[PDB]
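Form 12-C: Joint structure prediction
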Amino acid sequence: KRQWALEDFEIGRPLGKGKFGNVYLAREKQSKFILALKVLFKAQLEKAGVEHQLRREVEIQSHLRHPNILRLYGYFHDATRVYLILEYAPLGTVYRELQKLSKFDEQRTATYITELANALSYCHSKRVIHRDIKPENLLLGSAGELKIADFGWSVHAPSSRRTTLCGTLDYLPPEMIEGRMHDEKVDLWSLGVLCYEFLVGKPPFEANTYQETYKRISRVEFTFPDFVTEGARDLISRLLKHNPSQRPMLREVLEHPWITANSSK
Ligand SMILES: Nc1ncnc2c1ncn2[C@@H]1O[C@H](COP(=O)(O)OP(=O)(O)OP(=O)(O)O)[C@@H](O)[C@H]1O
Ligand SMILES: O=C(O)c1cc(-c2cccc(Br)c2)nc2c(F)cccc12
Ligand SMILES: [Mg+2]
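Section 2 - Result
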């Protein structure tokens, strides 16, 4: 843990907010190294009963080493808060990039999907499933490279564990919203949802209510606007399969002709 304390850092501006994570820019006083401190309130973690998720986030993320996965350097705590020491992502979230641009072109989409597929291939090689691949958890590095972050819902495959109860269902596959046993194929479904949202500007199963969203996901009810190309329609339709066993391997996504034709690499 390298015996860190709050007094070793100078805190800066807020970088973002999560349900539990309050994230700030920070500088280690001696080295001047810039990082991010994810601050969590012990009383709120205890009330919600999410201590096990925090333990998994720290245990899983601290051991991953990949350029498209955000590093977790360490942690410390005081009487009321837990502090996670994270690699700072200077270009913000893919969530904000999408609000600004409205929709991404095919080259930007394919490049993000490749980076996501490479990070997930590394995770899956260790049987680590992320399960919370959503644009607010995809951060951007100094070279504009995508970094997977927020490992709070991560687990070792297979799992029957529930995630959110009232939160966004938009990125979750049918087997997760139904409470069934699931594995690595959960991240392949989220990849298809992201590919669709990047090109269209909204996720495929979006609805005004929780029940209607649930209905659309369980029945896999989505249509493409006219501007979506054949190659993108083909990849998205292969990823958004109700049967998880029918979803492609990550190597099949990385070699898909629409991906190799449009990724910047
Ligand atoms: N290292 C970072 N660099 C820059 N911004 C960050 C960083 N980590 C998080 N953020 C910003 O803070 C927001 C909240 O962080 P995070 O996703 O880790 O919290 P959370 O959603 O509350 O966590 P959890 O789902 O584990 O309970 C992110 O969506 C992003 O906007
Ligand atoms: O009772 C506590 O002090 C407490 C500690 C921690 C904790 C300590 C070291 C590393 C990590 Br990760 C977490 N977490 C708590 C929590 F999540 C809720 C309530 C109390 C604690
Ligand atoms: Mg988050």
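Section 3 - Comments
Residues 93-263 form a domain with the Transferase(Phosphotransferase); domain 1 fold (CATH 1.10.510.10). The CA atoms of residues 20 and 214 lie 25 Å apart.
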